[PDB]
Every structure is written in structure tokens, then in C-alpha cells.
């Protein structure tokens, strides 16, 4: 038993809700919140900009130190940093950005990072400003992630669509 509420169960291990991932994080304090990161950990917009703002920019400060020490992530890769006031940990995961021409097949590699964590609150990778089809992203998520994933979908319209087109 865990503290997640109002989720619709999609599969054995995937759950989905219409929700702002920022507010869901502040209420659940999950062990892991996933950020829709880029390779530079520059949290300007989308989910990343919203999560970072909710940390009063502490996420960005920590991220800049990480990059200065380690260099950029790989597309499809991840790193674990602090969750600040939102979670114990933030798993920064880089899905391919279609608006940068990145290979959508790397989306499966990106979701594989979730398997290193038993439970996660997460957005749909490569959705929103990353330009991929959220329905596709959901299919890859269901077919790749084996751990328990609680997906927060900000847009109510998108959500209802994802649900009603789900197989």
C-alpha cells in the first residue's frame, strides 16, 4: 500500500491521473519524482521548468554543479539527484526531443531508467514541449516499465484522450 490517490489503473504496474506533477509531488512526497530533463539539465520550461520553479531554483543550482563535474547526460540516460521539497529523489530522465530531431527509438531506453526504482511519480517522457505523441509514449511506457509508475498528466483533455484510446 502506498499514498497515491485517484489514479486509474492501466496495467498491473502503470497508473495514470489528471494532475499537475508539481502539486502531486508536494502532497505525496514520493520517494522518486521523474523530471523530463535535457542533457544539460537546463530546467527552462515544460515539466522541468515547473519542477525547478517549485524548488525555488535549488534544482537548477544542484544540476549545474552536477554538469560541471560530470558533463552532459546522454539522450536516453538519467541521473539521480535530490528531490528537494518535492520528493526524496529526482530521477532526471532525458527522452528524445523530436523538436531537436532526436531518434524516437531512444524513448524505450529512456523509460528503462524507471526500472531501477520500485515506485515513481512521473510525466510521460518526450511529451509536451519534447514533441512526441503522448499516446505513443504511453504505449512505450506500458511495454517497457516493470516497476510501479504513477503518471501525472497535466492536461485534462489529453488525459481523457490517452484513456479512451488506450489498449
List of residues contacting ligand RM6 (CB under 6 A) = 20-22, 46-47, 50, 127-128, 154-155, 158
Closest residue to ligand RM6 using C-beta atoms: 128
User: How many beta carbons lie within 10 A of that of residue 147, not counting itself?
Assistant: 14
Least distance from ligand RM6 to the Cβ atom of residue 147, Å:
22
Beta-bridged to residue 18, according to DSSP, are 153
Of the pair 22, 141, the CB lying nearest ligand RM6 is at 22
Least distance from ligand RM6 to the Cβ atom of residue 20, Å:
4
How is residue 50 written as a grid cell? 515547473
Q: Residues 5-34, buried b or exposed e (16+ Cβ, 10 A)?
A: eebeebeeebbbbbbebbebbeebebbbbb
Of the pair 28, 158, the CB lying nearest ligand RM6 is at 158
Of the pair 44, 116, the CB lying nearest ligand RM6 is at 44
Of the pair 26, 108, the CB lying nearest ligand RM6 is at 26
Least distance from ligand RM6 to the Cβ atom of residue 50, Å:
4
Least distance from ligand RM6 to the Cβ atom of residue 159, Å:
9
Q: In what order do the strands lie in the sheet with 89-93?
A: 8-9, 14-18, 148-153, 119-122, 32-36, 89-93, 78-82
Residue 86 has φ and ψ, to the nearest 5°, of -105, -25
Amino acid at each position: 500500500v502506498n499514498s497515491f490517490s485517484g489514479y486509474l489503473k492501466l496495467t498491473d504496474n502503470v497508473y495514470i491521473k489528471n494532475a499537475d506533477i508539481v502539486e502531486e509531488a508536494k502532497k505525496v512526497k514520493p520517494t522518486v519524482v521523474v523530471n523530463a530533463a535535457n542533457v544539460y539539465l537546463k530546467h527552462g520550461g515544460g515539466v522541468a521548468g515547473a519542477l525547478n520553479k517549485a524548488t525555488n531554483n535549488a534544482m537548477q543550482v544542484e544540476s549545474d554543479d552536477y554538469i560541471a563535474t560530470n558533463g552532459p547526460l546522454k539522450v536516453g540516460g538519467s541521473c539521480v539527484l535530490s528531490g528537494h521539497n518535492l520528493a526524496k529523489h529526482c530521477l532526471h530522465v532525458v527522452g528524445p526531443n523530436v523538436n531537436k530531431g532526436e531518434d524516437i527509438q531512444l524513448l524505450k531506453s529512456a523509460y528503462e531508467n524507471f526500472n531501477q526504482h520500485e515506485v515513481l511519480l512521473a510525466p510521460l517522457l518526450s511529451a509536451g514541449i519534447f514533441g512526441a505523441d503522448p499516446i505513443h509514449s504511453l504505449r512505450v511506457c506500458v511495454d517497457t516499465v516493470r516497476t510501479n509508475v504513477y503518471l501525472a498528466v497535466f492536461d485534462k483533455n489529453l488525459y481523457d484522450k490517452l484513456v479512451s484510446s488506450f489498449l
